[PDB]
Ligand binder design. Structure first.
Ligand SMILES: CCCCCCCCCCCC(=O)SCCNC(=O)CCNC(=O)[C@H](O)C(C)(C)COP(=O)(O)O
Ligand code: SF4
Ligand code: SF4
Ligand code: FES
Ligand SMILES: [Zn+2]
Lengths: 62, 93, 119, 185, 688, 112
């Protein structure tokens, strides 16, 4: 699947459901092998994008 | 009546001078007591008075095709400056 | 210009007739610090650059492309003028623009407007 | 033996008209002298019993374009007997000929040739003062602050001419100078 | 020792000058300076985050805390006034421990996104953290975060990096004049924003990118493009308007990356407009790069320089001398205008003029087209009378200084012109010439304030020069100026504000139109970068040559296209509205086969069998020295010599048509902005 | 042998210039044999070349600058005497050698 650019590949990952109003993204299961810690505020309607990973986080209930 | 045909022979009259000096003082007097009369008799001639700090008093004159004549007004009185202007007007064209 | 040092230096004659600008770089607008001030530089006006048509890199044919920005710096205007005079470079000096310290006090934020005027 | 002793001894024994600047620190005890007294000072410091400096470590130049006397010539010295180091400095511009010390230290020849090659400082009474490091026919002294990093000429093989030729320099990618200086220094 | 940054302290009198000890050093400062300013005089540079010399004092960040002997607690040096005999201490353990405490607090909720921050190598927070901060962080808990908000197409906003210095709020409230930004909320949850979804519509809105010490406010077009250490800084000036703001062009190779302001206390004062800041985009779009001549079918073929010059020199010899017209552009420098004037004069014609104010204006005395009161001198005025001018769109920095004078000295502004929007309170006296007659005769309530003002300032606009009743209006304004004293030896108030960068140099050099019906009876028109003229006036038989750097409507009618270099690619002299001559410094190489304007005109003269004595740029400046000798004495503050008394009496009648607006689109004025991509999304969402 | 002490007046500088010129002229026969310049150049064209260099460097009035120029010329002469430099180099340096200049430069490039 080399035809898919990294933009299209990161645009297909479903947003991660988070219960709270804020989530911390590190980029990997092991913190030392990822990107610097990024705290994301989930106080909007659109999914919130990590500025390192491109991963999207959305608030679960409210 | 040479003051009424300046526009017929000339096409531009530049009077360079300095505003803070004792050499351009007779040039400043000439500009003050003669600009309004010359500009009134010649409403279309562009009599340009440009001044700077380190500038020698001069009086330029463009003619029919780019021709220019200059007179150094550094040792002249006001009547002498007027007579020089007469020489540029009459003899020039 | 007594460019004798330029003749006994080794600079080629073509580069000894360059026109340079002696100036003091000013403080950047994105920072409030004033550490990179007071030094004078010689600007060679080296702009003849193009693009490598293999990788898009910036190519040049001017030896004085980065000298005045990288190595050649002076502590005063007189030093740069003397350097240019001895190297036979035609130079023009740009005097730096300096800030003026005006009177500012915190109490001016809170000043009486005046009696209500029904004008 | 030590920076505290060498400084005080040289303060007293040395003629005063030679040295004009004496820094005493842990970075190094320096002596700054005029160029017309350098040979005298180095001959005194090579023969005196309590200052037996018999090794010339190196001779280097430093370029200060903002000074009137542009070049600074530094003589790093070593005394094996007393286990101490002395540094002697002079200053010279581009058209002054300073005295050579090859008579005292035979090893000074190549360092003086390198200083002349790199900075353009000439030495009086040097047996042979020719360039030692730069290419044959090199024009300019590279270690000066006004000399461009990449130089003025470039070398390539010219097939029609059947020899290696020198041409004006033309970089495919210019040197990118990055200004990391901070305004809060 | 010298003040930090070469700051000049102006002592009004030697008597009012207190003495302080910054670090045991005797320092003399006037009464009114603060501890921070006194330290700045003594060479000591205090850390600061929320203090800006052009903004009101607000001791928020607590970073400039110093030690004072008669103080139990550290004092904020930005707000504490200096007292006689006060002993300041900056390098004591108290001041240090305060600084590493404040830095530790500031770097506690700050996001770990330096690598992706556009303020990476130019951030005040990390530069001061390295210098005045500590080494290890004791904070491990969860940080706070905020959502990002859209402030328009110019300012990119990442508010998680906000340090809450409120400098943007103070700038918007005081300097910009458009109150739309403020601190919302209470406590650690306080945020900077507009509350409602609105965009920054101020022409000086881009200056919040520079005043922000962190990467919270950054440029959106210049997002992630490059880092500051990759950029070569060239100190150049503006040609977008006639103010001539001092800018600093940063480039990475043969293209320009960004434009940021440059300090000039007399012209721009650390600020530039949004049209200045984001005009660099058009310098790389639709650029003419090759000489081109139309074909029989009507298409432009790329041709060499020799053949194009041959064609134009062959056609120039077939038209009558009075049939030749040369029109300069608004971006033209003085040398090219002098060369064009000489060329046209030698061919036998006298029709040379500029794009804008070139309807027959008399440039005979040099006070009638200049800001006879310096821009920095407008800060002493007590009453501004804006006759038919809108400085907000014409000269944005003059408007900024007028707003400064109004908000600080409580000055009064009276406006006579078409309806418009002002960022300061203004009284709409009228909308046409009749208002000037009403003011002149008297009994108008504004006339009382005008005659009871110590330093009135009348600012006439350049748009008042294309009217048919120009002489009558200029006589009414001069009558108002004489009756109500504004022009005295100790204060000159009569001002004329130009809109184009080339107008001042053109008027100094004598480039004034002679015949009104000159572009209708022409046969060879040399448009020297003049695309702001309506080409539909040009007859269909005329041979039009367009010599410029960008393609516009004039290109679609030109017969020969001669590519030119932009203002960032040449050495040229430009004159301000106030008569101040400055020079541009080349920053990037010219694109394609384009040449400097004066070179192209001189080569055309040579091919057309007309010899010009000069052959180099230094030869041109010697010729200029015999015409306008003040255009070669650059960086000199030469005041005007004579006054309005010399003008002959002109008894015309003022017309009845109301004044017009000269600038309709502020983001679409010159050809560079007209070809820019940023100025389109700015004129599409920011203009109402 | 050793580098001579720096001169004190212009007369000594002129004497050193003449001595260097004479040495260079005596070095001409050696170059014609070390490099195959026999059927290339007359034995006087090179002499004229050194004379032309001395003459276009003849506006110097500083004895130190003159001494440095002489020293550099002597270094160049010594290098040429040895086989250090390539053959075409001296033939590329030591050989004696219409509308408007401005218009040709304009046709060439914008950067004069
Ligand atoms: C193959 C050979 C290799 C080496 C060839 C040589 C290469 C270097 C050429 C020399 C480079 C120099 O500039 S070294 C020589 C430069 N030094 C001077 O020119 C002194 C100033 N000139 C004068 O004083 C007078 O004009 C004077 C000309 C003396 C006579 O005129 P008078 O007496 O009436 O006064
Ligand atoms: S604002 Fe400064 S400290 Fe904060 S992330 Fe950006 S560069 Fe780093
Ligand atoms: S956005 Fe920038 S200027 Fe405004 S308060 Fe925050 S840090 Fe200060
Ligand atoms: S700069 Fe003074 S408290 Fe912020
Ligand atoms: Zn992430």
């Amino acid at each position: 699947r080399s035809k898919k650019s990294p933009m299209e590949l990161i645009s297909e990952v479903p947003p991660i459901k988070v219960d709270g109003r804020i989530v911390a993204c590190e980029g990997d299961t092991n913190p030392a092998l990822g990107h610097p810690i990024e705290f994301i505020c989930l106080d909007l309607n659109e999914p919130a994008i990590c500025k390192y990973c491109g991963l999207r986080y959305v608030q679960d209930h409210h | 009546a040479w003051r009424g045909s300046i526009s017929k022979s000339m096409k531009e009259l530049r009077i360079l001078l300095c505003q803070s000096s004792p050499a351009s003082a007779p040039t400043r007097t000439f500009v003050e007591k003669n600009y309004k009369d010359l500009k009134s008799l010649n409403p279309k001639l562009p009599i340009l008075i440009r001044e700077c700090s380190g500038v020698q008093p001069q009086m330029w004159a463009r003619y029919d095709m780019g021709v220019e004549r200059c007179v150094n007004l550094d040792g002249l009185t006001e009547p002498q400056i007027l007579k020089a202007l007469e020489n540029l007007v009459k003899s020039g064209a | 210009k007594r460019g004798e040092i330029g003749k006994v230096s080794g600079i080629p004659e073509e580069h000894l007739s360059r026109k340079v600008i002696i100036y003091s770089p000013a403080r950047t607008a994105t920072q409030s610090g004033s550490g990179k001030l007071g030094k004078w530089k010689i600007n060679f006006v080296s702009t003849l650059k193009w693009e490598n048509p293999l990788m898009g890199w910036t190519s040049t044919g001017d030896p004085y492309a980065n000298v005045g920005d990288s190595a050649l710096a002076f502590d005063s205007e007189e030093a740069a003028k003397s350097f240019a005079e001895r190297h036979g470079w035609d130079y023009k000096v740009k005097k730096p623009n300096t800030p003026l310290l005006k009177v500012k006090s915190y109490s001016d934020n809170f000043k009486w407007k005046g009696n209500p005027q029904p004008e | 033996m030590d920076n505290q002793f060498i400084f005080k001894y040289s303060w007293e024994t040395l003629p005063k008209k030679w040295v004009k600047k004496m820094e005493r620190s842990e970075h190094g005890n320096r002596f700054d002298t005029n160029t017309d007294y350098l040979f005298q000072l180095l001959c005194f410091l090579k023969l005196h019993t309590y200052t037996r400096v018999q090794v010339l470590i190196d001779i280097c130049g430093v370029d200060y374009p903002s000074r009137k006397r542009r070049f600074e010539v530094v003589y790093n010295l070593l005394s094996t007997r007393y286990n101490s180091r002395i540094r002697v400095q002079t200053s010279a511009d581009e058209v002054t000929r300073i005295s050579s010390v090859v008579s005292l230290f035979p090893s000074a020849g190549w360092w003086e040739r390198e200083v002349w090659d790199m900075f353009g400082v000439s030495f009086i009474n040097h047996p042979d003062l020719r360039r030692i490091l730069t290419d044959y026919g090199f024009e300019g002294h590279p270690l000066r602050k006004d000399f461009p990093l990449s130089g003025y000429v470039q070398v390539r093989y010219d097939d029609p001419e059947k020899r290696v030729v020198s041409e004006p320099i033309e970089m495919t990618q210019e040197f990118r100078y990055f200004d990391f200086a901070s305004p809060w220094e | 020792r010298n003040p930090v940054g070469g700051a000049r302290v102006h002592f009004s009198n030697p008597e009012d000058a207190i003495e302080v000890f910054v670090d045991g050093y005797a320092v003399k400062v006037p009464k009114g300076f603060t501890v921070l300013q006194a330290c700045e005089v003594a060479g000591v540079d205090i850390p600061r985050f929320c203090y800006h010399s052009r903004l009101s004092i607000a001791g928020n960040c607590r970073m400039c805390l110093v030690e004072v002997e008669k103080s139990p607690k550290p004092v904020a040096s930005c707000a504490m006034p200096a007292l006689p005999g006060m002993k300041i201490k900056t390098d004591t353990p108290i001041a240090k421990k305060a600084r590493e405490g404040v830095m530790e607090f500031l770097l506690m909720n700050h996001p770990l996104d330096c690598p992706i921050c556009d303020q990476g190598g130019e951030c005040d927070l990390q530069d001061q953290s390295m210098a005045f901060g500590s080494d290890r962080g004791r904070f491990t808990e969860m940080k706070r975060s905020v959502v990002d908000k859209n402030l328009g197409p110019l300012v990119k906003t990442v508010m998680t990096r906000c340090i809450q210095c409120t400098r943007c709020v103070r700038f918007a409230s005081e300097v910009a004049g458009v109150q739309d930004l403020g601190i919302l909320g209470r406590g650690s949850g306080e945020e900077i924003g507009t509350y409602v979804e609105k965009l920054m519509t101020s022409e000086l809105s881009g200056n919040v990118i520079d005043i922000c010490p962190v990467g919270a406010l950054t440029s959106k077009p210049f997002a992630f493009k490059a880092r500051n250490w990759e950029l070569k800084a060239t100190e150049t000036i503006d040609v977008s308007d006639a103010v001539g703001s001092n800018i600093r062009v940063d480039s990475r190779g043969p293209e320009v990356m960004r434009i940021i302001p440059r300090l000039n206390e007399d012209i721009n004062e650390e600020w530039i407009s949004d049209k200045t800041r984001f005009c660099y985009d058009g310098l790389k779009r639709q650029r003419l790069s090759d000489p081109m001549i139309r074909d029989s079918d009507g298409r432009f073929k790329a041709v060499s320089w020799r053949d194009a010059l041959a064609v134009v020199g062959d056609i120039i010899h077939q038209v009558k001398p009075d049939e030749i017209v040369g029109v300069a552009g608004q971006l033209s420098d003085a040398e090219s205008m002098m060369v064009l004037k000489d060329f046209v004069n030698r061919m036998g014609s006298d029709n040379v003029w500029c794009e804008g104010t070139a309807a027959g204006v008399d440039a005979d005395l040099r006070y009638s087209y200049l800001m006879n009161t310096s821009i920095s001198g407008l800060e002493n005025a007590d009453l501004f009378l804006l006759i038919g001018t809108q400085p907000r769109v014409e000269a944005a920095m003059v408007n900024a200084r007028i707003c400064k004078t109004v908000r600080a000295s409580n000055a009064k502004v009276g406006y006579v012109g078409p309806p418009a929007e002002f960022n300061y309170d203004c009284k709409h006296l009228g909308t046409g010439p009749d208002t000037l007659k009403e003011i002149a005769e008297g009994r108008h309530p504004f006339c009382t304030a005008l005659k009871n003002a110590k330093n009135p300032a009348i600012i006439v606009g350049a748009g008042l020069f294309n009217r048919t009743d120009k002489n009558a209006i200029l006589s009414s304004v001069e009558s108002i100026a004489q009756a109500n004293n504004v022009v005295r030896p100790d204060w000159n108030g009569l001002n004329f504000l130009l809109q184009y960068a080339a107008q001042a140099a053109a008027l100094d050099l004598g480039l004034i139109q002679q015949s009104a019906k000159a572009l209708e009876s022409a046969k060879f028109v040399y448009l020297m970068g003049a695309d702001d003229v309506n080409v539909d006036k040009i007859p269909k038989d005329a041979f039009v040559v367009y010599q410029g750097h960008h393609g516009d409507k004039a290109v679609y009618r030109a017969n020969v296209i001669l590519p030119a270099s932009a203002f960032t690619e040449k050495e040229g002299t430009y004159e301000n509205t106030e008569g101040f001559t400055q020079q541009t410094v080349p920053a990037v190489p010219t694109v394609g086969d384009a040449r400097d304007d004066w070179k192209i005109v001189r080569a055309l003269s040579e091919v057309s069998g007309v010899k010009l004595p000069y052959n180099s740029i230094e030869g041109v400046r010697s010729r200029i020295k015999s015409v306008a000798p003040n255009l070669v004495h650059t960086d000199e503050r030469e005041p005007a010599a004579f006054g309005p008394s010399l003008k002959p009496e002109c008894k015309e009648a003022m017309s009845t048509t109301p004044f017009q607006t000269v600038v309709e689109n502020f983001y679409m004025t010159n050809s560079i902005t007209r070809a820019s991509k940023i100025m389109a999304q700015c004129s599409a969402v920011l203009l109402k | 042998i050793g580098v001579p002490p720096n001169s004190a007046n212009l007369t000594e500088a002129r004497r050193r210039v003449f001595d260097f010129f004479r040495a260079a002229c005596r070095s001409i026969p050696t170059i014609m044999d070390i490099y195959n310049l026999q059927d290339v150049v007359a034995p006087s064209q090179l002499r004229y070349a050194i004379s032309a260099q001395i003459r276009n460097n003849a506006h110097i009035t500083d004895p130190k600058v003159i001494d440095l120029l002489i020293f550099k010329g002597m270094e160049e002469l010594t290098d040429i005497v040895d086989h250090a430099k390539q053959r075409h180099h001296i033939i590329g340096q030591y050989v004696v050698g219409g509308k408007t200049d401005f218009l040709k430069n304009f046709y060439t490039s914008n950067y004069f």
